[PDB]
């Protein structure tokens, strides 16, 4: 009889605790009838858990909060009984896969990892931390299935605090030691170990971080990945560890872990958007508005931002084998805004990647095979170019990569696939990725006398794959530098009402790009086709006259990509001479920047070859 129960060594009545929690659920209303709304949400969604705020419990009833914190192992099952009783007193014929779990949580940490003490054992705590590792899924047996190997009579045994009461005899027949555990007829539930470090923001000065073990079960297992930051609420357990696996002597010093009751992630940061985006797309100069919205924190390079915008939108993928991906390269000294552009667009785009061409990079560009250290089994770590198979791959320090990595990037750009010839493994991985690269001069600062290729010292074959190439040189001009300095001091005097506005602009830019990618699929009009065709012939004219060469057919492919992307930006769904003219303009601006020899002007064969015509006749 439930009314006779008290928690062991506690003097708290289980029935009274259940009634107090029931009236809490029935009458708490003011977070600004609260939790009956959550019960209805459970009823329609079908998720068997209820999140409850311990501060709400405290403000409703201090004593109930004290009981919950002190004796969670009994009080939380009491709350489960309370909530299930209420839920099935209402909604009488709704069906749930499981009984509801109450998941009490504190909004902020009550303790930190360094101050956890034996006084806190079997007590509900909340702590903040960063996740270091997450184990494979561990099945925990919940009900053992036994079958008699003599007469096939079966029985089921319930789990008593982690040990089985194995039947020593059969019931149907009477043979001894005949009941065998049928492992895959038994019942199991999910379990997982998590290793959690104290946050860098929470560590004391100059100390090595402390770490705790969490154990999650059932539905909380697969909610947290390594690198995440979480406020975890759970019961601080202490368990013995046996001195060696074949002996039941245990060390006097106990191991500790946290049974997870609740996770709250603390580093995470439709028609109501579509209606805005539809009219905003037909607003005038939306192209300029989006391009200027890109990277507000730096002084403006209009054509660089326009090219990055068209890279984000991309062409149209169709089938044959032509890449819709657009490749962009940025050049300039160290200390220019190119790395800020890379990091910004990596934060912006979905399926993005950011890595360094240098061999010291955090995640490599090429794919490799390694022994998973926590498992010892091989894992195929596909590089960033394969991980960004439907996004932008940002490559900082693009000049410093070794020749093997240059070959890998040549393969990825030409074929949009990465070959795997690892030991045993043979496969063709997919790398339909838009590469945004940032190179440096081999010298300290950009040599004006030498060409782009002569300064960055990358092969002309790989340079020829990029659709656009730009330079971040700053003039020795007061007209530019004075206004840049004004922009910089204003950026210091940035405030939160500007931060929110720029965040809203970036968010609607994200929604715009996602909505474009979702459905909008441009096609070529006849006038656009004629414009592209005569554009290729026009680019060939200037070189074919006088006997040199000024263009080659892959530039027509680049122009097609840019025109399709611009139609995608303006939501036209039909490519037109407007898009083709913008493509020609931006492509020729990129050529004016990158392909300009200091003596003879724009030379096309400086991309097809190392050096240029003047050098070829100087030697």
């Amino acid at each position: 009889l439930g009314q006779k129960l008290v928690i062991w060594g506690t003097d708290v009545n289980v029935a009274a605790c259940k009634e107090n929690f029931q009236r809490f659920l029935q009458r708490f209303i003011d977070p600004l009838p609260l939790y009956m709304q959550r019960l209805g949400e459970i009823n329609v969604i079908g998720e068997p858990f209820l999140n409850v705020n311990c501060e709400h419990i405290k403000s409703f009833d201090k004593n109930l909060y004290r009981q919950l914190i002190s004796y969670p192992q009994e009080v939380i099952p009491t709350f489960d009984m309370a909530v299930n009783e209420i839920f099935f007193d209402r909604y009488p014929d709704s069906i749930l896969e499981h009984q509801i779990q109450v998941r009490p949580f504190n909004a902020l940490k009550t303790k930190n990892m360094r101050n956890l003490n034996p006084e806190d054992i079997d007590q509900l705590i909340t702590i903040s931390g960063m996740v270091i590792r997450t184990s494979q899924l561990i099945p925990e047996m919940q009900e053992a299935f036994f079958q008699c190997q003599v007469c096939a009579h079966t029985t089921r045994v319930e789990m008593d605090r982690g040990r089985i009461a194995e039947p020593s005899v059969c019931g149907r027949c009477h043979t001894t030691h005949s009941m065998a555990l049928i492992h895959n007829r038994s019942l199991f539930s999910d379990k997982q170990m998590i290793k959690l470090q104290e946050s860098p923001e929470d560590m004391p000065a100059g100390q090595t971080p402390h770490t705790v073990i969490l154990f999650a079960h059932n539905d909380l297992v697969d909610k947290v990945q390594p690198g995440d930051r979480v406020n975890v609420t759970g019961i601080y357990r202490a368990v013995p560890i046996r001195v060696n696996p074949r002996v039941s002597n245990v060390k006097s010093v106990y191991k500790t872990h946290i049974d997870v009751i609740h996770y709250r992630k603390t580093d995470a940061k439709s028609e109501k958007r579509v209606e805005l985006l539809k009219e905003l797309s037909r607003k005038p100069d939306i192209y300029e508005r989006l391009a200027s919205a890109l990277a507000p924190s730096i002084y403006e390079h209009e054509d660089i931002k326009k090219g990055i915008l068209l890279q984000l939108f991309g062409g149209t993928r169709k089938d044959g084998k032509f890449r819709a991906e657009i490749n962009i390269l940025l050049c300039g000294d160290p200390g220019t805004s190119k790395s800020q552009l890379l990091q910004y667009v990596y934060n912006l785009v979905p399926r993005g990647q950011y890595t360094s061409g240098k061999g010291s990079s955090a995640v490599g560009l090429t794919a490799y095979v390694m022994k998973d250290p926590e498992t010892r089994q091989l894992v195929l770590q596909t590089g960033a170019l394969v991980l960004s198979d439907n996004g932008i791959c940002c490559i900082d320090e693009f000049d410093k990569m070794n020749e093997s990595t240059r070959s890998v990037l040549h393969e990825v750009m030409e074929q949009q696939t990465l070959s795997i010839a690892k030991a045993g493994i043979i496969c063709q991985l997919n790398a339909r990725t838009s590469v945004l690269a940032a190179a440096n001069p081999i010298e300290s600062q950009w040599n004006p006398k030498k060409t782009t290729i002569e300064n960055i010292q990358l092969p002309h074959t790989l340079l020829s794959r990029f659709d656009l190439i730009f330079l971040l040189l700053d003039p020795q001009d007061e007209a530019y530098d004075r206004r840049l300095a004004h922009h910089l001091v204003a950026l210091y005097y940035q405030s939160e009402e500007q931060a929110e506005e720029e965040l809203l602009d970036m968010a609607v830019l994200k929604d715009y790009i996602a909505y474009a990618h979702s459905t909008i699929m441009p096609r070529l009009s006849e006038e656009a086709s004629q414009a592209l065709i005569e554009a290729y012939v026009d680019m060939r004219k200037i070189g074919s006259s006088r006997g040199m060469v000024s263009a080659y057919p892959r530039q027509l492919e680049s122009l097609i990509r840019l025109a399709e992307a611009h139609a995608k930006v303006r939501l036209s769904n039909k490519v037109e001479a407007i898009d083709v003219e913008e493509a020609k303009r931006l492509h020729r601006e990129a050529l004016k920047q990158s392909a300009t020899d200091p003596r003879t002007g724009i030379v096309d064969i400086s991309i097809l070859t190392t050096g240029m015509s003047a050098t070829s006749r100087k030697r």
């Binding site: 009889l1 928690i7 192992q73 009994e74 919940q142 009900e143 008593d160 020593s168 019931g171 001894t176």
Partner: protein, 173 residues
């Protein structure tokens, strides 16, 4: 014992043997020997043959056999399958309610103040709050070995529905 695990509606070795008798026509010779007044000397023999022939059968079940039995038995098999499945699902749900929605090493202990233990102290309960709705003192007890003398007698064979051709032949016989 190895090959008596045949499922119903399948031709066991005995069923195949009876089919051999049927196709050979020795069944008609047995009917002749049973009906003959002159060869009455073999009556006990013929009785033993007929007994061993009809060893496995049930009279009413055999008499119910006829032309339209395939559809009847197919539908009956499907319906019985669903009945068995529903019973197992119900028992699984009851067990899932009897245990809690927390793992077994989730602790917690209670004192049931009214219940005296085997001593004079109040009962301390460790098997979870869910079990106290239908508490019984034999939750964790091992049953007892019935000694050899007291072990109840068990039925010597399961019943299986023999092959339909053999059942039709035995009905006609």
């Amino acid at each position: 014992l190895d090959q008596e695990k045949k499922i119903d509606d399948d031709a066991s070795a005995h069923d195949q043997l009876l089919w051999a008798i049927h196709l050979s026509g020795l069944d008609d010779l047995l009917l002749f020997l049973a009906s003959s007044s002159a060869e009455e000397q073999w009556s006990l023999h013929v009785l033993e043959i007929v007994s061993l022939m009809f060893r496995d059968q049930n009279p009413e079940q055999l008499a119910g056999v006829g032309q339209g039995r395939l559809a009847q038995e197919r539908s009956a098999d499907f319906a019985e399958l669903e009945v068995l499945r529903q019973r197992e699902m119900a028992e699984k749900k009851t067990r899932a309610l009897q245990r809690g929605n927390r793992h077994s090493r989730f602790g917690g202990s209670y004192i049931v103040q009214g219940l005296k233990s085997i001593g004079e102290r109040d009962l301390i309960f460790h098997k979870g709050l869910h079990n106290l709705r239908n508490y019984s003192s034999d939750l964790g007890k091992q049953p007892k070995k019935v000694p050899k003398r007291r072990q109840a007698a068990r039925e010597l064979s399961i019943q299986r529905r023999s092959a339909l051709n053999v059942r039709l032949f035995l009905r006609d016989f």
